[PDB]
């Protein structure tokens, strides 16, 4: 379309800026004569003309307008302004605008009001104002609910739907008299009967603070709640389906929500300004949760918790997700990104701060340590590609809803969190939170870019007279404006350090230039024979310092507790000393750094920076390792070996090796739990136990196979008395299905269909994908596409579980190639989780044959495109090419190593 016309460009003009809106919405929770669920609404937006213009361009998506005074909208003056007549309106679908063409120009610095009357489908599409459904017995309950982020507020009413177009909102919901209406604010006066029909009530809500459109929420339901005033005076309510609330499944959320909210208010010296914060769990929900200001929405599996059937891992998810969305009340709601390219200012912050809040609520769990696995090493996988992207992408590259949704990714979340963890480490959290309090105070009810953050952290540094090698801006710009991270290579003979951009494939082509030349300013912590040394700043590509020189038996390690976003390599003599330490007394190295040694070496091997046998040798000590973290780091790195080798001669020896390495740990837990009667007291030990069972069973430990099949059989014999502790259910279910046949699968499927807990249904849904039978995986794939069987919110997640099964690989890849339009159009091609599907189905590719299929897939689907999975496809191409070379270079050496070390 003609790019010279403003209505064909994706960003709004800067000519108009809204001040406030009133919106009335009326959902119809029974189908009409067409079989459609609809909502009807009206709106008035008051806006200021900032530059004279003869067009009003406003967002509108899938809305039908009722003509009023001869046009789709009515345009009125404010404070004496006299707007021109409307010529005509048009709906421009690609850019999602209503365009009001005027007979003259509006006047600079004058206000106007525009009135609309409209209707949309209350679709089961999880976007905008939409419907969620559940059963209470045989009664169908239909809920009207919302998801606006990123670009769906415009699907419920016409609005200037960009985050820096903040305004106040005056919401009215018209709803059946028996149902409760909820929104961001509390109701304004009593709910009155609708004059035209007293079967409906009218509920008006108090005006919102100045806020972004993507944070609006409107909900109509018959949910129940539990409530408690938090110590900062804010009312907390936990809302869910009546049966869940009655069962007590909202009680854990009530225990933690107010205390975390108060904690954040104190920690950031910035009060939460609203009278209440409702948490509400929806049966149908696209994302995990969403921080709507005053009305935080969640999947049921993220908010509800059953102490008798949910696992410890589920409990950790609840407190962390609550902490995450509450963090956004400050980092996202009060202070908001200027535009989506800087999304990490919301998501990177919430991803870091969630640990502070969760740790406050559950101080015995030691959750902050999990950042190394769950954020740092998670994101380093994609951020070692040439086709990664900077934490802050240039704003001009981010224009379409697909491009926006694409950024809800490991970079914005986990690299965001990692860089903040590093910043907190070198500043101290006291100095960090001081600068953040200043940032929040200055920009409250406004919008920010990354530079605004540095300015306020600098103010705290300057006040404390902290000396750094340069300004906060110049340090942190290196981590924010260019992709990737360095490997720091130490020569302990001379004490020299050097850095270079770490790429998993040496031959990959970095085409994004960096004005910083892929050189970082790096805060380097270190230990020598277990004792922490003085901190160091690496500012150049190479330096020398006696901190990094050793002689005799001494070893050094850099990046104590992996606070810095970088990998570390050493001369091979220092590596050998580290391996000797691991054999002599592995407890002499901090637990996080044991995970580091394993994960860094495996990644370095891929990049041809150490021999692969060095990385495999780093796993030898695991036979006597009981800690969760180093085992999880090993299993994560070896996931790649499984993806590369589970269709090859290398796989037997790999499994034999893992069987050997895990058997003593498995036997330890068998004994320590009094033959699985008890679970460990400490959370990390609980997780270690689960990984020991999973690893033992996957790799053929006979005692494990007998245990899981025995327990599952006992359950089948007593379906209402499940003998499996909730912590063990995912792994027992999966392995019992893998070891069994049609009978076990059918039992688990019936349990899934009859489930009355999302946590239990989720474990069964993943387990069913563990069948070794191709016909069963094919049948299960057909169920994922049937919304009567698997909720749409869960379709692509279940497909991913199937493709992760070696027998499901060909099945799902062939399905994806054959059904691309269907998946793109109906299964979230422009939404948040689409990249996950592309990543999962392609990560096994290691052959020229598969590469050629992938290239042909790209060519064949040019016209449809790849929506929010566009970058993921480019990454899949890069990785596949790297994998072909890696398998060629490593398959013989790896086969020999596993064979010779598994005996």
């Amino acid at each position: 379309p003609d790019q010279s016309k403003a209505w064909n460009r994706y960003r709004l003009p800067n000519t108009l800026k809204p001040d406030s809106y009133r919106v009335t919405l009326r959902p119809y929770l029974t189908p009409n004569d067409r079989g459609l669920y609809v909502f009807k609404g009206s709106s008035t937006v008051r806006f200021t003309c900032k530059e004279a213009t003869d067009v009003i361009i406003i967002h509108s998506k899938k809305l039908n307008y009722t003509l009023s005074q001869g046009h789709r909208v009515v345009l009125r003056g404010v404070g004496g302004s006299q707007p021109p007549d409307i010529d005509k309106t048009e709906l421009v679908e690609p850019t999602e605008y209503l365009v009001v063409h005027l007979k003259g120009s509006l006047v600079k610095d004058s206000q106007y009001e525009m009135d609309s009357e409209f209707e949309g489908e209350l679709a089961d599409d999880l976007a905008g104002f939409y419907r969620s459904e559940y059963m209470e017995g045989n009664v169908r309950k239909v809920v009207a609910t919302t998801q606006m982020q990123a670009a769906d507020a415009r699907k419920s009413f016409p609005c200037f739907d960009e985050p820096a177009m903040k305004a106040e909102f005056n919401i009215t919901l018209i709803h059946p008299k028996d149902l409760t209406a909820l929104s961001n604010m509390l109701p304004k006066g009593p709910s009155t009967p609708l004059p035209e029909d007293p079967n409906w009530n009218v509920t008006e809500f108090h005006t919102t603070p100045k806020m972004s459109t993507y944070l609006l929420a409107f909900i109509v339901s018959e949910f129940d709640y539990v409530e408690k005033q938090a110590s900062n005076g804010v009312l907390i309510r936990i809302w869910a389906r009546p049966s869940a609330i009655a069962a007590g499944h909202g009680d854990y959320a009530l225990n933690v929500t107010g205390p975390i909210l108060n904690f954040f208010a104190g920690h950031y010296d910035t009060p939460y300004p609203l009278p209440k914060s409702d948490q509400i769990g929806l049966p149908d929900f696209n994302a995990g949760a969403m921080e709507n200001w005053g009305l935080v929405t969640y999947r049921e599996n993220s908010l509800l918790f059953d102490p008798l059937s949910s696992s410890s891992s589920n409990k950790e998810r609840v407190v962390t997700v609550i902490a995450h969305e509450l963090a956004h009340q400050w980092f996202g709601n009060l202070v908001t990104i200027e535009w989506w390219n800087d999304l990490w200012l919301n998501e990177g912050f919430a991803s870091y701060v969630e640990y502070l809040g969760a740790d406050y609520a559950e101080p015995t769990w030691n959750l902050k340590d999990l950042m190394v696995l769950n954020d740092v090493y998670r994101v380093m996988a994609v951020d070692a590609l040439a086709s990664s992207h900077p934490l802050s992408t240039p704003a001009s590259e981010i224009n379409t809803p697909a491009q926006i949704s694409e950024l809800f990714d490991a970079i914005s979340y986990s690299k965001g969190a990692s860089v903040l963890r590093m910043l907190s480490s070198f500043l101290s959290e006291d100095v960090f939170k001081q600068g953040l309090a200043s940032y929040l105070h200055t920009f409250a009810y406004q919008n920010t870019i990354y530079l605004n953050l540095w300015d306020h952290l600098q103010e705290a540094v300057n006040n404390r007279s902290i000396q750094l090698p340069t300004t906060v801006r110049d340090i942190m710009n290196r981590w924010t404006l260019q992709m990737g991270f360095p490997v720091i290579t130490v020569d302990t003979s001379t004490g020299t350090l050097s850095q270079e951009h770490f790429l998993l494939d040496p031959d990959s082509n970095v085409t994004r230039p960096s004005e910083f030349n892929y050189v970082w300013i790096v805060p380097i912590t270190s230990i020598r024979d277990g004792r922490q040394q003085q901190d160091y700043w690496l500012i150049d590509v190479r330096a020398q310092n006696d901190l990094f020189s050793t002689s005799g038996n001494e070893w050094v390690l850099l990046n104590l507790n992996v606070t810095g976003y970088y990998r570390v390599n050493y001369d091979e003599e220092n590596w050998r000393k580290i391996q000797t330490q691991l054999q002599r007394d592995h407890s002499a190295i901090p637990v996080i750094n044991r995970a580091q040694i394993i994960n860094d070496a495996f990644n370095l091997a891929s990049a041809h920076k150490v021999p692969v046998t060095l990385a495999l040798n780093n796993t030898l000590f695991l036979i006597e390792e009981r800690q969760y973290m180093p085992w999880e780091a090993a299993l994560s790195s070896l996931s790649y070996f499984k993806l590369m080798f589970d269709r090859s001669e290398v796989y037997g020896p790999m499994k034999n090796y893992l069987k050997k390495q895990v058997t003593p740990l498995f036997i330890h837990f068998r004994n320590n739990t009094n033959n699985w009667r008890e679970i460990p007291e400490n959370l990390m030990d609980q997780y270690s136990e689960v990984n020991a069972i999973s690893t033992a069973c996957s790799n053929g430990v006979p005692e494990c196979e007998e245990m899981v099949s025995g327990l599952f059989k006992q359950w089948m014999e007593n379906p209402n008395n499940n003998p499996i502790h909730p912590n063990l259910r995912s792994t027992v279910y999966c392995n019992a299905i893998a070891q069994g046949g049609e009978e076990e699968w059918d039992f688990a499927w019936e349990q899934f269909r009859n489930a009355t807990l999302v946590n239990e249904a989720d474990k069964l849904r993943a387990a069913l994908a563990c069948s070794k039978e191709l016909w069963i995986l094919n049948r299960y794939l057909s169920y994922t596409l049937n919304p009567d069987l698997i909720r749409k919110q869960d379709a692509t997640s279940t497909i991913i579980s199937i493709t992760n099964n070696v027998i499901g690989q060909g099945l799902v890849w062939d399905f994806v190639q054959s059904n691309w339009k269907k998946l793109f159009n109906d299964y979230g091609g422009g939404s948040f989780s689409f990249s996950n599907l592309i990543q999962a189905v392609t990560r096994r590719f290691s052959t020229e044959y598969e590469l050629q299929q992938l290239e042909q897939f790209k060519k064949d689907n040019e016209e449809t495109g790849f929506g929010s999975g566009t970058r993921a496809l480019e990454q899949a191409l890069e990785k596949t090419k790297a994998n072909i070379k890696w398998v060629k270079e490593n398959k013989e050496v790896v086969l020999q190593w596993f064979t010779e070390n598994s005996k």
Partner: peptide
């Protein structure tokens, strides 16, 4: 956003 959690993406889940």
């Amino acid at each position: 956003x959690v993406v889940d």
